[PDB]
Design a protein around this ligand. Structure first.
Ligand SMILES: [Fe+3]
Length: 479
């Protein structure tokens, strides 16, 4: 097929569309014998050229990559996430769905169909692989064969239209905690709060309303609460009618933080809202309670981080104000009123794609890992560093991938089920941009600054990834 000659489909964004298997990737260094499991990640990768002359990267069909690490070797498997969209378009031999989150640009033949590309997260839970996209139910797949089952509607018990791509697992119960925004239709202010049991049952779906419709991409959990930030990357049917990107950022609107009790029968009146001045924040490192306080650690920027979801009043993109920093938003449940208790910048390092040792989700975490944008580094062609913060000692570690590479989201892998927090490894894809290929890097998680202990060569150029996760072999049918 002939694709557009635009930045979204050329250079690093050239379509790939490869399904493949490779055993025992070539490598340097020593692949830890203690790793036995798999790292899953997803890349948007268009099956067909877009209906409109220039689509964006966030809109490509989900292609799932798995790195099966065992016995000191890494095997590679890549397969399509076979969404209804993928299947419909494969049958038709052409694109049928249009622009990002814009049903007014779809073929009449797919009116009412689920629009998911399942392209944002590859998450393992309850014996299934979840290929996730926040405008639809999640797609479920077999984590071992990577065949596709279909969308998870919980047998029809799910009443909302959508499911998050940033699920959190509660370490105490083992439940997946999820939201679904735009729950009653596009651009609505209805949201669901859901929990899924380890056995796969939807055990709670609570409907509530938020102050305004916006991109509710991420959230936090604590022991007793779901913590939902309301940030004004807004959208509307009118925007779609006027031919604009679904979302745009409004610098004049306030930011809110909602505290939803994680219990049966929660009502709107049970939800507490805090309010602060405008900023941008997308990803959540973690959240926790301490005394009467809730600590919500996010990557906050002064202004919009999505150039493709532009300022709603026509401002050009401000790259300097898009720089995000790990920041603790602190609210006090024993206070009166809506003011935050604190907004505390935690590092001067510019960072995003935050990760923790997920075994400690919802509890106070000593460690965080991030992709860092170090604008001081040489560049000979930008997420160019891996960044680790020890929040107890304050010590920061950095590893730079060099002047002709960039990095994808890291993932923490525990050494053992009983290992202390952060005792284990970091895995991440590295884009060798000049060489037109990719590496899988493996680090000792608490000494990233010495460099990866193994560099695993991938003889296939991977595309831009979104989110990824590790699961142990006995969780994915590979033991
Ligand atoms: Fe995300």
């Amino acid at each position: 097929a002939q694709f557009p000659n635009t930045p979204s489909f050329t250079g690093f964004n050239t379509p790939s569309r490869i399904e493949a298997d490779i055993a025992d990737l070539a490598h340097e260094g020593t692949i830890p014998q203690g790793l036995n499991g798999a790292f899953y990640r997803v890349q948007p990768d268009p099956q067909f050229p877009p209906r409109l002359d220039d689509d964006i990267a966030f809109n490509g069909d989900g292609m799932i990559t798995r790195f099966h690490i065992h016995d000191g070797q890494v095997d590679f498997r890549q397969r399509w996430a076979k969404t209804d969209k993928w299947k419909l378009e494969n049958a038709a031999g052409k694109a049928l769905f249009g622009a990002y989150r814009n049903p007014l640009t779809d073929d009449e033949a797919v009116k009412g169909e689920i629009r998911s590309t399942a392209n944002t997260n590859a998450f393992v839970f309850g014996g299934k692989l979840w290929a996730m996209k926040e405008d639809s139910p999640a797609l479920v797949m077999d984590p071992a064969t990577m065949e596709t089952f279909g969308f998870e509607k919980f047998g029809g018990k799910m009443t909302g239209q959508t499911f998050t791509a940033h699920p959190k697992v509660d370490p105490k119960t083992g439940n997946m905690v999820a939201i679904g925004y735009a729950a009653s239709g596009l651009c609505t202010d209805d949201v669901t709060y859901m929990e899924v049991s380890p056995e796969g049952e939807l055990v709670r779906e609570v409907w509530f309303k938020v102050p305004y419709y916006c991109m509710m991409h991420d959230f936090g959990i604590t022991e007793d609460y779901l913590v939902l930030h309301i940030v004004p990357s807004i959208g509307s049917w009118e925007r779609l009618e006027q031919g604009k990107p679904h979302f745009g950022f409004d610098t004049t609107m306030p930011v809110h933080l909602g505290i939803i009790p994680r219990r049966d029968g929660v009502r709107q009146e049970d939800i507490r809202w805090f309010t602060r001045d405008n900023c941008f924040a997308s990803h959540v490192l973690n959240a926790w309670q301490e005394g009467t306080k809730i600590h919500f650690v996010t990557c906050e920027a002064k202004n919009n981080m999505f150039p493709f979801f532009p300022d709603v009043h026509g401002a050009p993109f401000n790259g300097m104000e898009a720089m995000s920093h790990p920041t603790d938003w602190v609210v006090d449940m024993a206070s009166n009123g809506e003011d935050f208790a604190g907004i505390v910048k935690l590092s001067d390092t510019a960072a995003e794609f935050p990760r923790i040792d997920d075994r400690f989700t919802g509890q106070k975490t000593r460690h965080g890992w991030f992709l860092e944008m170090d604008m001081k580094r040489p560049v000979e062609l930008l997420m160019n560093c891996l960044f680790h913060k020890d929040f107890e000692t304050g010590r920061e570690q950095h590893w730079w991938c060099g002047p002709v590479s960039s990095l994808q989201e890291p993932c923490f892998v525990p050494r053992a089920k009983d290992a202390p927090e952060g005792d284990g490894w970091i895995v991440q894809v590295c884009n060798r941009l000049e060489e037109q290929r990719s590496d899988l890097l493996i680090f000792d998680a608490l000494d990233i600054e010495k460099g990866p202990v193994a560099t695993v060569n991938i003889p296939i150029r991977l595309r831009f990834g979104l989110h990824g996760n590790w699961a142990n072999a006995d969780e994915i049918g590979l033991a």
